[PDB]
């Protein structure tokens, strides 16, 4: 769920 | 325990016939205050004090009559506290955060200017529900993202979140990727606007990349400014 997207979406903007 | 700017000389005696004014705004439990200190450097006495605020960009207005019941004496210096709210009238001011102000007394009227530090406009319920931060983040088009460089700041992942916290910038998430920590954070203006931020902190690198996403981005340059001030002070 939510946790994941933040890593998802951090990683991406790195 | 928020961040408060030292008192700055808003209206120096030399301009208001002996009346001198030191100033600073404060946010406490989401209630705004203009912290002044009056000084009669003159040789008359001063009764009949009122302060009036011009229209500004966040509807900012005094919420009481000025709190000053005695004449002000040759040489007496006193602290005032002016409660403010933002249900007042509005005009796009430039700079966005400028307050044109009329103070009056028995002697005359003195117009002067002071800048509202925006930080004291950060409400307390500015922490985005987590779903809500993500959806919003991708929503607001990257066209709409400004980036700032927190020149020389060195304070930790952990110290950063906590200062911004007192000043109502709330950390939603802190992730690390290739060694760099990235604080995901949200704040919100008294007038309702969200600012969303990603602070990115490097191993070594003396700067701190700040990225703001915001429905009205003219605000962002100011959020920078006062994230800065916080992180320095």
Author numbering:
A (entry chain P): 1 to 14
B (entry chain A): 705 to 937
Give excerpts from the publication:
Adaptor protein complex 2 α and β-appendage domains act as hubs for the assembly of accessory protein networks involved in clathrin-coated vesicle formation. The C-terminal “appendage domains” of the large subunits recruit interaction partners from the cytosol facilitating their concentration at sites of coated pit formation. We identify a large repertoire of β-appendage interactors by mass spectrometry. These interact with two distinct ligand interaction sites on the β-appendage (the “top” and “side” sites) that bind motifs distinct from those previously identified on the α-appendage. We solved the structure of the β-appendage with a peptide from the accessory protein Eps15 bound to the side site and with a peptide from the accessory cargo adaptor β-arrestin bound to the top site.
To understand the specificity of the β-appendage top site we solved the crystal structure of β2-appendage in combination with β-arrestin P-long. By circular dichroism this peptide, in solution, is not helical (unpublished data) but in our β-appendage crystal structure the β-arrestin peptide is folded as an α-helix in a groove between α-helix 1 and the antiparallel β-sheet of the platform sub-domain. Thus the peptide folds on appendage binding. In our structure of the β-appendage:β-arrestin P-long co-complex, residues D3–R13 were clearly visible and the induced helix breaks down after the arginine residue. The main interacting residues on the helix are D3xxF6xxF9xxxR13. Our density for D3 is not well defined but the side-chain appears to make hydrogen bonds with R834 and R879. F6 is in a hydrophobic environment created by F837, L838, and I876. F9 projects into a hydrophobic space lined by W841 and Y888. The guanidino group of R13 forms hydrogen bonds with E849 and E902. The core motif, as revealed by the structure, is DxxFxxFxxxR, with the additional constraint that this must be found in the context of an α-helix, unlike the unfolded nature of peptide interactions known for other appendages.
